[PDB]
Symmetry: C2
């Protein structure tokens, strides 16, 4: 499914705005913005911590002239289970809170009249949705009848609601359903190879440069476009060409356009190559999180975040720990930021080797089935973005378990089959010698928190422990390694010398000592600090109103270590043969 | 041993000030203030976290006229093992970091000349000092040779150094060594009964009121002083009489004076009676802790703290979790603040029922021997302060263990034998039905943290859980109950609605809901919030630069809940028949 875009042949109507909202088995509505998480909008603590079904409702008018058009209703994201009703008719259901879903609804609309859309969203986690969790009953001596808790083991808050825009769009009855683009370098040219999915068959395809000059054209539902003297897309030079696809049939006419970038990505030895040059990742793990709206899409915050990425000198980030909005990937295309996009397989770990995760009752064949469908949906959505340069299949799963090996072999095999054009990783906090899964990926991503979660407060252990660990990863697997997470919680304004945990000084010193180690290791091709910004988590005595490891505050202002990273990364080239 | 006080017959020389300081097996000195903890004075992180022996050194001059006087060298406190050298001569050794020690040193001084005092202090904890801990060797795959950690399980930082003043004082060769005072009410009079310890035998004892009027006198080494129409000491009316003791012998003359207060304390049924009226404790658990100086005595901070106690309307505190400086008790006498003074038996708990504490290898007969000596030293020091109204033998020990019963039976039995004039408690976090120790004390003190350490964030459980729990304490033991701790960490300036853990709002709402429960229970005779002020702890992912449960910041300014308590406690009488 293609991102909804207006053209000569397609209308788009955005239903974002103020909706009516209620919780299960309640008749009274309140007002609720869309897109947004509902948790922080009100002062009702029982809604903040609500677990169950909520219902959104809105009126909309369909123009009579949309008859004899396809009418699609698209929901960008709703966490985690959703059902969509048009005038009381169920038009689609969806499982998974971080990818879009849509249905054709012309059969159910009142033309030239009022219509009602209702969207049910259920935030109840189970062990066969990603990320997983479990609702548990607690009726003991200290809890009243009916006390229940939603348990989950990922470290970000279970925000719920409609997190990305709801839109209605039209197409002709015979229309461009999808297309695939692959770019190759050939002699002094680039090739853009394409295939179009449609019931139609007569297509003209045109490629235009930045100045609207036509640089290539082809008649054909599949084909190759040759670009002589191409300008390649890469961090530091985000050149985009505009691909125009025109269906020209007897009764149907359809146009779809997308900006694409010409680049190659390849792993060879201990090098991560973009356009055949050795890349060095400088960046962050991020989160879709901001004040008040929770996980809701906000283009103000998105553009602010990319300007901060360019300001600090980052060239990349990982979409920890789930696919982000398409909007963020289009921006990464424009700004020239390399993206590792990650499936929502986070929380597959009970920090305890006595509780097994990959076992009947928890992560099983049903979870695997969902994970495989997720990879198919994710690659289908994002396969044409130049900014996505790697897929991450999971974050900190219990990869030391025997059952994790067969599980992830299947996930990894399916991902590569779906997209052979990008490398694959998995983000590990398991010990190097214990993971049964990292031997199957292209690039190793390791999260390490020496002197924070272990030997807390003792910065002196970092060089000893980190160098020994990373050398063992390389000795066992002989793959490029990204230090995919490291950092320390810092309360803005907490200062100390000597540095103490939770101060800005400790965060900067820890990060500084980690990267001094990486500079001595020629097989380390990247550093991603956790996290870009402070974000909300569930409440616990270990979380000082959320996770405070941001390099920026939640309102997008820098802590001390942001300036250290700006100075370091201004000296580090994007392409660096270590 | 009596607090050093100048008189017509006694000189006092305070050696506090700037000393030279070094660590073990090092020849170079730095400067170090005394009294103070050494940990936060410098920018040397290796001294902040030092474990082992440190050495203080200072020159002093003895006047030739001190010949034929006793010369005593007193150390107010040094944590935790100490040795005192005068001109290289060992004059005393001491075990325990929170009580004073002294020696007579006239045999070792150079009269009319320079002298050198050196004090060794060792902060290495063991299982037979209080509070206990253990130095552990960690030489594994991730730690270099010689890595060691001091483990301990009490929740305050192991500050070390000379924490209370070092002084030298003179007495005549035959002198007042000690005295005991007990006050009784009789008809319309009060009696002050006394006994004096001395090699002398001829004494005149005089009692003076606030205006220096003599109200009673007696000739005798022991005797009774009758005060007609006494003004009693109590919170809200801290009347002090001055007791003057004069030794009058042939060759020796000695005078010692102390302010005393006339009051009785008695537990009867579910009432805590002071001067036969039902008291209600309003107050705090405190700590000896302040910026930069750690646990060092500071009279500025002490007077500030008492003015804040009076401002907020408190009438009491507990010396969590160790005896405080004598200076603080003299101030509590002046201000009329009731003190529960506690022995340093904190940390006798490995939050884990698989690791036993009262067992060979940990808390054993050697620990018990030290605990019993501590109770003797503590009562000998503080027996004459009107402000001390109860002894606490421990805080949050593993009282569910079989071995804890015999241990504490002996501690409690010895405490009562040493001082039958004050009730005894033990501060519990064990479950009511599991403690094997609370049945042996006079008043129950229970620490409860519902919605903070358990059901974190859910304020709705408080009333259900706390009322059920406290009713079970009373049903099992039929004693008065003090809620001796409850509270929540709050970062100053962290605000939210709805309230979230670590915000000022959550701290206030939790405390408000707890005390609403207490008001409905006629057997609850007290509320002590944890803590008076933010204080330092060892580093851990659960401590945001120390413990943030203070009602005041570490620099002694109020958080939101301080104003809630001021308003509540301004409405609650000190004496309240519930
Ligand atoms: Cl983290
Ligand atoms: Cl606490």
């Amino acid at each position: 499914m293609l991102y909804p875009k207006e053209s000569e042949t397609r209308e788009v109507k955005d239903l974002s705005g103020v909706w009516e909202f209620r919780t299960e088995s309640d008749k009274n509505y309140i007002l609720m913005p869309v897109p947004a998480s509902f948790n922080d909008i009100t002062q009702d603590i029982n809604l903040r911590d609500y677990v169950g079904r909520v219902y959104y409702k809105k009126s909309f008018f369909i123009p009579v002239y949309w008859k004899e058009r396809n009418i699609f209703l698209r929901v960008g994201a709703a966490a985690h289970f959703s059902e969509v009703y048009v005038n009381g008719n169920l038009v689609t259901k969806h499982k998974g809170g971080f990818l879009p879903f849509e249905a054709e609804i012309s059969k159910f609309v009142n033309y030239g009249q009022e219509n009602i859309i209702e969207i049910m969203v259920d935030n109840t986690l189970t062990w066969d949705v990603l990320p997983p969790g479990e609702l548990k009953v607690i009726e003991d001596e200290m809890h009243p009848k009916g006390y229940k808790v939603l348990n989950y083991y990922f470290d970000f808050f279970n925000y719920s609601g409609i997190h990305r825009p709801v839109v209605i769009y039209t197409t002709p009855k015979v229309y461009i359903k999808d297309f695939s683009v692959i770019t190759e370098l050939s002699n002094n040219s680039a090739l853009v190879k394409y295939s179009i999915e449609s019931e139609g068959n007569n297509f003209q395809v045109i490629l235009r440069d930045k100045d609207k000059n036509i640089v290539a054209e082809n008649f054909g539902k599949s084909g190759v476009l040759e670009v002589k003297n191409p300008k390649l897309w890469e961090p530091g030079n985000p050149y985009l060409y505009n691909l125009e696809i025109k269906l020209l049939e007897k009764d149907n006419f359809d146009i779809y356009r997308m900006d694409i970038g010409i680049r190659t990505v390849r792993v060879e030895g201990k090098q991560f190559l973009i356009n055949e040059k050795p890349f060095y990742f400088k960046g962050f793990g991020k989160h879709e999180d901001s004040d008040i709206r929770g996980k809701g899409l906000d283009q103000v915050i998105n553009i602010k975040d990319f300007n901060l990425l360019k300001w600090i000198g980052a060239n990349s980030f990982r979409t920890s720990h789930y696919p982000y909005s398409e909007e963020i990937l289009f921006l990464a295309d424009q700004y020239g930021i390399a993206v590792i996009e990650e499936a929502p397989a986070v929380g597959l770990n009970l920090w305890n080797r006595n509780e097994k995760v990959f076992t009947e009752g928890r992560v099983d064949g049903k979870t695997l089935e969902h994970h495989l469908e997720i990879m198919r949906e994710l690659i289908a959505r994002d396969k044409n973005h130049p900014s996505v340069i790697m897929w991450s299949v999971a974050n900190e799963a219990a990869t030391y378990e025997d059952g994790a090996e067969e599980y992830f072999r299947r996930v990894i095999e399916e991902t590569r089959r779906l997209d052979p054009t990008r490398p694959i990783t998995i983000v590990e906090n398991t010990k190097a010698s214990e993971t049964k899964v990292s031997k199957y990926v292209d690039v190793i991503c390791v999260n390490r928190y020496y002197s924070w979660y272990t030997d807390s407060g003792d910065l002196s252990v970092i060089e000893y422990q980190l160098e020994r660990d990373l050398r063992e990863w390389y000795e066992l697997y002989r793959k490029p390694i990204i230090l995919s997470e490291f950092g320390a919680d810092a309360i803005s304004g907490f200062h100390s010398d000597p540095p103490l945990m939770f101060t800005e000084e400790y965060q900067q010193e820890m990060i500084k000592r980690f990267v001094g180690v990486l500079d001595r290791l020629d097989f380390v091709v990247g550093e991603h600090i956790w996290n870009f910004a402070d974000f909300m988590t569930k409440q616990s005595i270990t979380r000082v109103v959320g996770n405070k490891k941001g390099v920026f505050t939640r309102n997008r202002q820098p802590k001390m270590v942001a300036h250290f990273l700006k100075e370091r990364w201004s000296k580090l080239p994007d392409f660096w043969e270590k």
